[PDB]
Design a binder for this molecule. Structure first.
Ligand SMILES: [Mg+2]
Length: 851
RNA sequence: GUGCUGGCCGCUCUCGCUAGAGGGAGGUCAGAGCACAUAAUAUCAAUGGAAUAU
DNA sequence: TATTCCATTGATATTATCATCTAGAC
DNA sequence: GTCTAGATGATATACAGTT
């Protein structure tokens, strides 16, 4: 009902409504706001003031003192009510009596089946079984186990229940009624049970969300403080002193600034540098200790200082939440409210008994929808259809497969434009077989034996590489117990390829022009930027820029006029591209990504151009625009990419992906480029789309999955001029391979290996511990260097990278030497040989295999 | 059902004019295939522009 | 190279998406 | 009967270069 079901949702537009629906909705929202605000004060939370960006705050003690005045003598009852409501679950399903005026308490506990079977089996149960059964139930725990034994022995179950039922009644079910009579709580409709139930559960949801957020926030602050306090060295003190000195000159620190300043301080300089204040401060005697520090220590000190600066920036408490926006109001079938669903020829009719009827329209998402009524649920059957708004289009209509789901609740919500929407959250049912093998077997370093015994004897698996160009590179294989082949699945057996590595979709013809357009936009931006500077000091623009600007036909020759001619020409081309791609439905995804990049650049060009007249000293801030067209196009592209991958892999069980990193902090130089791929949300969408078809997804370690040889495990050199080719040197021969089919193959190799074989590490964690225990004798070992950089593990080095190439560990230097050897060999234009990874003459894939 | 496109004409703004470029609302003429898990709250990091300094 | 102000975007955590007894009715 | 509405319901699946 909940363990093996997958929830999804979609909306229907409410065309019209009868009865007093709007009054009911408005009353619910107003009471939600009021009582959420009140119960936030009953639970004395600290919070930061919103008006001054959290400079000041209200301590928990002041909130506690104000609560003592607000509640008075009901102080203790409210605390118990709040504890029960915050814990949640079934023991708190009777809190709606805080609002309901006609609430009546039953004086006996419910005769549930779990207690029927307990009482009916008292005769045969020994004392140890009895005490172990009732040590977790708070109702049954009200009676000692020995008394249970005498009751079972001397009395019949029919009279046992009568003797016991009043004794084990839950005494926290009457707390709300105690508060309402004592504080005079009144809601808008105190004689409607469903109204009170819905209101209480919505308010409780909001308060529980804030409770969990608040506690994790207060925990994380202390965690950060302890982590800062555990790392204290001399370099940290020196870096703190250096950072303070720079802030007095309004300069501030950075990793590049510190590193390059230390680099440039040793060498005497003549020409002034971009980082000159830092260099001048670094040449002072009091920072001599920074100039002789080792790189690892300097990096660690910088990291600790960065953590300290982030820690000092946090507020004391989170903001008080804003309750003003509307909530989705849920109504169900066993008590929350009452609704009936009727699918008609042209409408969907939702019947709320005494709050009117809602008439809704049909979707193409819920195509050919039918609903069948069952005792406490609806069975939904529908399909997806193409929406073609053009009446006479040449596209042949398509229809998807059937979908069967279970519906038990509905939601109602109002959009800010004044339209009402009905949400239908349904649940799909699939076997939890594929999702448990992915989480318990393939994500574990050492799976337990009973997991291994339950695995099937055959599997189909896949792997894929995702990039900004040639978006997807997939590979499909089949593994099984008792099979033979090049692929070795750890703890499971062997397997052989089904569909070798390839590139699913190459880039389109229009990708070349969409880069020239962005180059032109950036060049115009530079022209504007230097025109302003030359205007300020009464100089003249350089001849190169004037020659470039004069290439477009213009009605004048002054620079401002030439820059405006260039901007008009550049947007005539962007609009043409947008129109042409929208005409076809955005067939190519790489072209769409390039178009998005060009549009983003053009927006900055316009923003710069609008401020082309400002005078020194005066600032101009950004102006708010209520535009959401870019966010709806960017989202459409991510969903379309997730669909291509899931459509390719529709017959697999497990799919392997590398866990990519999202945009980074200020120290990264290319995080504007990775915001455009935007990888983490793409992975989320891929997981959601695979999960709708009962396919498991695993994320494997990514370091070195683009540098090892899939066949022999040797390192290669990836060309800098062209990133789509990688070169290897084996058997005194030079070989070349595609660097996207190498990534997919290495991802498949690491997935089948549970990511235990490392690419590089420091002289541990579960993966490295298992690798050390299996490849070598034991996990408690030390390392000594030998020969020309090879390492021998013995049962010394500290803090050094060690790489695994070809089955042996090697030191950092030998890895550099091998890559350099390949580089010098290729620089001499030595002809290489093409190797295909889908060859059927390959006898073993040795990449990331330690056994 | 939700989402994503241009040309042309007035009006109205900001900037410039040896000269035009851009924004907003509206009218009109066209274009239009393939995706869809729906919400509330909180928190962190960056992107772009402008001014300032070595 | 750095600082400050605006508005917008990527990402990650919480809260959610009912079942079964009982008392009245008719 | 069988409805249909209100008050009450045992505990709990990993790991740490890449775009
Ligand atoms: Mg790649």
């Amino acid at each position: 009902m909940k363990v093996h079901e997958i929830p999804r949702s979609q909306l229907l537009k409410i065309k019209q409504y009868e009865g007093s629906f709007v009054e009911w909705y408005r009353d619910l929202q107003e009471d939600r706001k009021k009582f959420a605000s009140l119960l936030f004060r009953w639970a004395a939370f600290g919070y930061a003031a919103r008006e001054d960006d959290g400079a000041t705050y209200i301590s928990p003690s002041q909130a506690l003192l104000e609560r003592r005045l607000l509640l008075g003598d009901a102080e203790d009852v409210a605390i118990k009510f709040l504890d029960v409501l915050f814990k949640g679950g079934a023991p708190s399903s009777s809190c709606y009596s805080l609002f309901y005026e006609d609430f009546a308490l039953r004086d006996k506990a419910k005769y549930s089946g779990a207690k029927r079977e307990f009482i009916e089996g008292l005769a045969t149960m020994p004392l140890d079984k009895i005490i172990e059964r009732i040590r977790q139930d708070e109702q049954l725990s009200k009676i000692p186990a020995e008394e249970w034994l005498i009751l079972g022995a001397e009395y019949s179950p029919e009279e046992i229940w009568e003797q016991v039922a009043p004794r084990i009644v839950n005494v926290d079910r009457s707390l709300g009624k105690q508060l309402r009579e004592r504080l005079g709580i009144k809601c808008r409709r105190p004689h409607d049970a469903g109204y009170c139930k819905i209101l209480m559960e919505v308010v409780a949801r909001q308060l529980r969300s804030h409770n969990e957020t608040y506690h994790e926030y207060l925990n994380q602050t202390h965690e950060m403080k302890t982590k800062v306090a555990n790392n204290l060295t001399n370099e940290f003190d020196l870096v703190c002193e250096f950072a303070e000195v720079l802030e007095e000159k309004n300069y501030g620190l950075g990793w590049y600034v510190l590193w390059q300043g230390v680099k440039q301080a040793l060498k005497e300089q003549k020409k002034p540098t971009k980082i000159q204040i830092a260099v001048d401060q670094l040449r002072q005697p009091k920072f001599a200790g920074l100039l002789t520090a080792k790189w690892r220590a300097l990096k660690g000190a910088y990291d600790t200082w960065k953590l300290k600066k982030r820690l000092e920036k946090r507020k004391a408490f989170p903001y008080m939440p804003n309750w003003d926006n509307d909530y989705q109001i849920p109504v169900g079938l066993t008590g929350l409210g009452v609704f009936t669903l009727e699918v008609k020829r042209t409408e969907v009719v939702v019947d709320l008994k005494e709050h009117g009827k809602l008439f809704c329209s049909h979707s193409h998402y819920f195509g050919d929808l039918t609903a069948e009524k069952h005792p406490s649920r609806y069975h939904l059957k529908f399909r997806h259809k193409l929406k073609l708004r053009k009446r006479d289009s040449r596209v042949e209509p398509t229809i998807g497969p059937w979908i069967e789901a279970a519906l038990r609740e509905i939601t109602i919500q109002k959009k800010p434009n004044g339209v009402f929407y009905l949400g239908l959250p349904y649940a799909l049912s699939h076997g939890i077989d594929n999702f448990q093998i992915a989480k318990r077997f393939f994500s574990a370093a050492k799976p337990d034996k009973e997991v291994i015994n339950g695995l099937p004897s055959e599997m189909v698996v896949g792997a894929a590489d995702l990039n900004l160009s040639n978006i997807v590179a997939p590979v499909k294989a089949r593994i099984g117990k008792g099979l033979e082949g090049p692929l070795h699945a750890l703890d499971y057996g062997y397997g052989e390829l089904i569909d070798g590595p390839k590139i699913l979709t190459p880039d389109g013809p229009r990708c070349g022009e969409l880069i020239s357009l962005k180059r032109d936009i950036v060049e115009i931006k530079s022209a504007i930027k230097e025109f302003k500077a030359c205007q300020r000091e009464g100089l003249t623009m350089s001849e190169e820029t004037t020659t470039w600007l004069s290439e477009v036909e213009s009605p004048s020759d002054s620079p401002r006029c030439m820059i405006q001619s260039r901007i008009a020409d550049t947007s005539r081309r962007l609009n043409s591209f947008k129109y042409q791609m929208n005409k076809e439905g955005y067939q190519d995804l790489a072209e769409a990504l390039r178009l998005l990049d060009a549009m983003d650049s053009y927006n900055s060009l316009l923003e710069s151009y609008q401020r082309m007249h400002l005078s020194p000293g005066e600032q101009s801030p950004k102006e708010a625009k209520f535009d959401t067209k870019r966010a709806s196009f960017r989202d459409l592209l991510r969903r379309r990419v997730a669909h291509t991958i899931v459509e390719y892999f529709d017959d697999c069980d497990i799919v392997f992906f590398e866990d990519l990193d999202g945009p980074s902090d200020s120290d990264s130089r290319n995080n504007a480029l990775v915001k455009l791929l935007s990888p983490r949300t793409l992975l989320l969408y891929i997981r959601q789309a695979l999960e709708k078809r009962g396919i498991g997804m695993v994320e494997v370690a990514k370091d070195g999955t683009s540098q090892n040889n899939p066949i022999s495990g040797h390192v290669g050199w990836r060309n800098k001029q062209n990133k789509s080719e990688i070169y290897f040197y084996e058997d005194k021969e030079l070989l070349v391979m595609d660097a996207d089919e190498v990534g997919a193959m290495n991802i498949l190799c690491r997935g089948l290996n549970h990511s235990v074989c490392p690419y590089s590490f420091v002289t541990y964690g579960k993966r490295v511990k298992r690798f050390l225990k299996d490849r070598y004798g034991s996990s408690n070992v030390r390392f000594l260097v030998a020969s020309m950089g090879f390492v021998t593990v013995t049962t010394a080095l500290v803090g050094k990278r060690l790489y695994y190439h070809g089955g042996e560990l090697v030191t950092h230097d030998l890895h550099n030497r091998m890559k350099d050897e390949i580089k010098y060999l290729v620089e001499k234009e030595v002809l290489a040989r093409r190797v295909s990874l889908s060859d059927s003459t390959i006898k073993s894939y040795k990449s990331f295999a330690h056994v």
